[PDB]
Structure 1
Amino acid sequence: MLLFCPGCGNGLIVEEGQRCHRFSCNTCPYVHNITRKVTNRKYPKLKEVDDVLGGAAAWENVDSTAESCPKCEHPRAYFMQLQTRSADEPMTTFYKCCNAQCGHRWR
């Protein structure tokens, strides 16, 4: 979302100089007084949160149900899933398994 001034067609800015915040121009005295709330952002940007809690972190997130492997079915890999990019795109699932001398991690 963006706004342009009806009087002059340039972009508005947001400022406060009195009891109430205002949408104003920088070339002409046109202004609108914001009394209400608007609900759409520019979707800000901060990078990949990978090792927020890397390694064998806290045990509060334990859960009961889990899947199983098709080949061997040994007793150690409980579930986990993750996300792609931003607020409006899907989230992904990976099944990674790891004892030794192999390379498995199923999507």
Structure 2
Amino acid sequence: MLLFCPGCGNGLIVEEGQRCHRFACNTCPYVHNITRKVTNRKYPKLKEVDDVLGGAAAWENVDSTAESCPKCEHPRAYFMQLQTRSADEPMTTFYKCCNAQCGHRWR
């Protein structure tokens, strides 16, 4: 930890004297011998995440259900709408249909 001298208030460092390890300041003859054990834990953060991802139930966090696509007309789908282009007057669509492991990706 951070310790300060009661005399002048400067930071105390740990050195070795003639009898035992002691805290001392660099601007005053104040010292303090260590009698019992002193500890300073920090408890660093541990890795809690298992880093497992990609589940089909978690992936199907989308609105698209029971629609009709021009590729395989399967019910389960995955739609995305984009409006980030002023030159294109209409909007932009991205539809994916992987109900029977098709994996389509078009505009």
Q: Deviations over 1:40-70 (max 9, x none)?
A: 1467999999999999999999999999999
Secondary structure of residue in 2 paired with 1:95? strand
Q: TM-score, normalised by structure 2?
A: 0.38
2:77–2:99 CA contact under 8 A, matched in 1: no
Could you tell me how far 1:19 is from its partner in structure 2? 1.6
Equivalent pairs, count: 107
Distance of 1:39 and 1:91 partners within structure 2: 63
Would the alpha carbon gap of residues 57 and 100 (structure 1) be closer, same or farther in structure 2, given more than 3 Å must change?
A: closer
Q: Which residue of 1 aligns with 2:36?
A: 36
Which structure has greater strand proportion?
A: 2
Tell me, which stretches of 5 or more residues in structure 2 are unaligned?
Answer: none
Distance of 1:88 and 1:30 partners within structure 2: 77
Would the alpha carbon gap of residues 79 and 101 (structure 1) be closer, same or farther in structure 2, given more than 3 Å must change?
A: closer
Distance of 2:81 and 2:33 partners within structure 1: 46
CA RMSD of aligned residues (A): 13.9
2:65–2:77 CA contact under 8 A, matched in 1: no
1:12–1:24 CA contact under 8 A, matched in 2: yes
Would the alpha carbon gap of residues 90 and 102 (structure 1) be closer, same or farther in structure 2, given more than 3 Å must change?
A: same
Could you tell me how far 1:36 is from its partner in structure 2? 0.9
1:76 aligns with 2:51: no
Would the alpha carbon gap of residues 15 and 39 (structure 1) be closer, same or farther in structure 2, given more than 3 Å must change?
A: same
Q: TM-score, normalised by structure 1?
A: 0.38
Query: Larger C-alpha radius of gyration, 1 or 2?
Result: 2
Would the alpha carbon gap of residues 103 and 62 (structure 1) be closer, same or farther in structure 2, given more than 3 Å must change?
A: closer
1:45 aligns with 2:10: no
Structure 1 runs of 4+ aligned residues shifted over 3 Å read: 41-107
